[PDB]
Amino acid sequence: RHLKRELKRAQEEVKRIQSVPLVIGQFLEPIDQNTGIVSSTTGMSYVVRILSTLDRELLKPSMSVALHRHSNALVDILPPDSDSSISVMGENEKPDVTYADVGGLDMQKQEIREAVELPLVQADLYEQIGIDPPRGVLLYGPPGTGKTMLVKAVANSTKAAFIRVNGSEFVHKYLGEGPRMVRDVFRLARENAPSIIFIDEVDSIATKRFDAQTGSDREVQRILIELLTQMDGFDQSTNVKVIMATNRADTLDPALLRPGRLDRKIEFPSLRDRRERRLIFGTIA
Amino acid sequence: HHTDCKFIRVSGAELVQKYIGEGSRMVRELFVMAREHAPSIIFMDEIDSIG
Amino acid sequence: DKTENDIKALQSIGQLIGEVMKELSEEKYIVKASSGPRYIVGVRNSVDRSKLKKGVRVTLDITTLTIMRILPRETDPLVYNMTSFEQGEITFDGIGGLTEQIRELREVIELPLKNPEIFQRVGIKPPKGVLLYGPPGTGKTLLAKAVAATIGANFIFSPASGIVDKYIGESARIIREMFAYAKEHEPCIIFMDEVDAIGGRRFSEGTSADREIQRTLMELLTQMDGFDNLGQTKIIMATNRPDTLDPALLRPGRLDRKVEIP
Amino acid sequence: ALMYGPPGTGKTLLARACAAQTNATFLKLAAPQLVQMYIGEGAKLVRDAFALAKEKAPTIIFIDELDAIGTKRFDSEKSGDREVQRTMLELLNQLDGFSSDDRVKVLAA
Amino acid sequence: NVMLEKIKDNKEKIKNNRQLPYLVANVVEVMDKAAVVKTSSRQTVFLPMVGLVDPDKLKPNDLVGVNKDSYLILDTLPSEF
Amino acid sequence: NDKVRFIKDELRLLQEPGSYVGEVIKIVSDKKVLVKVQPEGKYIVDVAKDI
Amino acid sequence: DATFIRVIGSELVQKYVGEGARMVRELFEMARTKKACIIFFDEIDAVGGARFDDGAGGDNEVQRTML
Amino acid sequence: GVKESDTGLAPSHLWDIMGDRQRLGEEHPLQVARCTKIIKKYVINLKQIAKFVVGLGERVSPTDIEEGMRVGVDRSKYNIELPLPPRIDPSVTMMTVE
Ligand SMILES: Nc1ncnc2c1ncn2[C@@H]1O[C@H](COP(=O)(O)OP(=O)(O)OP(=O)(O)O)[C@@H](O)[C@H]1O
Ligand SMILES: Nc1ncnc2c1ncn2[C@@H]1O[C@H](COP(=O)(O)OP(=O)(O)OP(=O)(O)O)[C@@H](O)[C@H]1O
Ligand SMILES: Nc1ncnc2c1ncn2[C@@H]1O[C@H](COP(=O)(O)OP(=O)(O)OP(=O)(O)O)[C@@H](O)[C@H]1O
Ligand SMILES: [Mg+2]
Ligand SMILES: [Mg+2]
Ligand SMILES: [Mg+2]
Question: What is the rounded CA–CA span in Å between residue C10 and residue B48?
């Protein structure tokens, strides 16, 4: 009965170490399970003991985590929903464009209701036939085709989480900032599945020619390599794999467009016919 | 797959290269990685249809 | 007292600024410091939990690290130097003999600014965007002074070659903060002067400087038109040769009027 | 005021002799210096050759050569003219009227 | 004679902090009354401004010295070149 | 009794003055190892009596 | 028995413009400090070409190091 | 192996008497810096980017401190100890001299 007093005084001690002030690192992988490798957010690797009596159920896949200050020890885990680069936008109000303002481009509208909308609501039609749904969606054309207008149209009607970012949000400016944000975006999406991820322009990141003689080429390049390895993990999750767009498709790096990441290429014509130009006039009129 | 070759598709892609950062002068290093990990098929697709 | 006020400062110390990156729970908030690493901290109880939100700047303790209180938004030191130039002003007149062209720039700027009730009824989305181009030596620049004096809305004269800096990713973060700035202080007009610097096209096979342009230009493209569409910003752009420009800046619907000064 | 023509006409020799003789503060500048290899250090060198010159105003900046930045070529197709031309245009901004520069002159050879 | 030794008292302290060495930083903004400086060690600190230093000299961008040990605006210096 | 004595000692074990991940560039037959700390620069430093 | 300073004129070239500007400056000072020197530039047909202006190439890096 | 062969040889044992009392002195290190502005006190810019105002040393003449010159400063509280010759860009120019 005396030792039940002593188990309580030892339990108190350790809960104070769990709590604030803490720096936030990331868990890469275990080397045992009582010891792991974390990269702090100073751009260095540390080998740290792991507080036994913790959940490794979400821990083993790479995911944010809390560390102690001087001690440097993993004293608790953080939700993959928490410490994210961007709050989801599916909870904010919906984009202002609806399908009444889409006029023409009716040919690309039947290839986007199939590729995006149908695999979220009904995963069970694809699997029972035995076909694999298209993975990533690419949009490309001249810079006026109103690519973004079609994406807003599909964002109002689905009423599922949305995550909207750019490809200069990932811009390098601290050490190791660029690789860190790519992890946060793919882990939020699995957590609140289903969802549609849009990267608006990705013309600067995908470069056909690197030389890697300057630091700024080594940050662009670490980001892009990380982006391929996270599109692989993203397979077999209800989320329809990342939509992305480019204005000039002829700078596109070859590993990105390769199958296993992007499969569909929705070209956006600009000639069109007389029945599809009429509609564009009719909604602006 | 039957012979148990490492299928290294080489291509002109510098995304994978990070140690020298260009394959214009990489010869010995591709050999010395593929000689360790023999057997190997270096699948040199030279495009030669770029206009 | 003048030597005594210094002794009362000396016992104080700097208090590291951050902003609230994201609510974790009720009693823990994550800040992103300005040195770098994100922390998880506690709160003074002077301030409610509803007064805080994600994106308010907070000061932090030296070493204990606790939110002390909410601060207003920090303003860049660069966006105070740009507001200053207005020296050289002149009123309506600019290029005499082209008072018809002076009215065409007011159709875009001064008429929906003062009275937005004329563009509500007609139903065309409000304009924005003007490019000025002509033979060099013609006073593209004298007209910019004419439309910044008289309107009296906030003016920011941002030379394009005067925001490229040694640090890279710092010429993106600055120019993002300026479009926010023009929404807060509305109505506001952003005069990009000598856009021939960041007028490089696709390229990105040459030097690494040619990829600093392209990366700083993609961010001006999705910030101007994307999901983002800031309603209280107007852009006036001065360029000499109007064929440097990347074919994404030639492009109507970015830029309503494409004025040629003769 | 610009000095141009054939070599040998003592362009560089006269300018120096007459700018030190009249006790007007003569700054020595050579255009090949404004060319730099860092990204955005040439734009920071022009504003700093200007900021010094507004204090001692009036003063003479003598540019020996001007073909280092004076390329007509700034519509170019994959060249290092995109970094050079950025210090020519930061010139034209730091040559526009905003007062406290109404009193800086220029020679250029 | 009792008041004059209170001014000397303060000032001999003030003479020790004023001399070298002190970091050099610039003024992001004067928030007023408070001065926010971004240093050349590339962080930021919110400080109670030194009132012996006027709020007239402190304008946005100014180049000021800052004490490393306690981040206080020590004195003013003419903008470098 | 075992349990309240696992916690009291786990409080000592969790305290780490510091621990890195390096990588062996090359050994030298001085009984020293040239290890690159992986973000920084290099350091030549000998082995403990554990290896 | 005067200090001889050999240069290769095709040693200056790099991709980063005015990279051979730095070199040419500092070499010129290093020769100014020692008294009695001789600065022997071999093979200056590269960086010593005619005055021309192609209007489209990369003669713009080359002509920096000459000016 | 290289079996423990390190330069020095037979005279470096007499050097061990002289060089152990100096090696502990802070004579070294002097973090090498470079002046950006003489303000008629002195302004150095470290090569890490972080600016400091320093002052005279033990007995240095005020003529030594020149514009754009490198100087060595005390490792802890920064103060000029020993000025040092200029520019660290010369080194690709000393291998060209035959
Ligand atoms: N079918 C249409 N119906 C009505 N309006 C249209 C149509 N197509 C294009 N537009 C008009 O053209 C504008 C610009 O296109 P949008 O905003 O979709 O950008 P984008 O072409 O994808 O540009 P970015 O190159 O930056 O990706 C729209 O805001 C819209 O007003
Ligand atoms: N229309 C005009 N009315 C009165 N003065 C003028 C006019 N146009 C030019 N000027 C004079 O020419 C000077 C310089 O012209 P300005 O710099 O405005 O031309 P620009 O087209 O902007 O050329 P650049 O930007 O190529 O230097 C003016 O400061 C002013 O004295
Ligand atoms: N008009 C002149 N009267 C007397 N001497 C002259 C004259 N022109 C040139 N010289 C002599 O020629 C020398 C070289 O001239 P300098 O090199 O200064 O002229 P420049 O026009 O700038 O030629 P460049 O720059 O093409 O070499 C002068 O130092 C001077 O001795
Ligand atoms: Mg778009
Ligand atoms: Mg102008
Ligand atoms: Mg001359």
Answer: 73
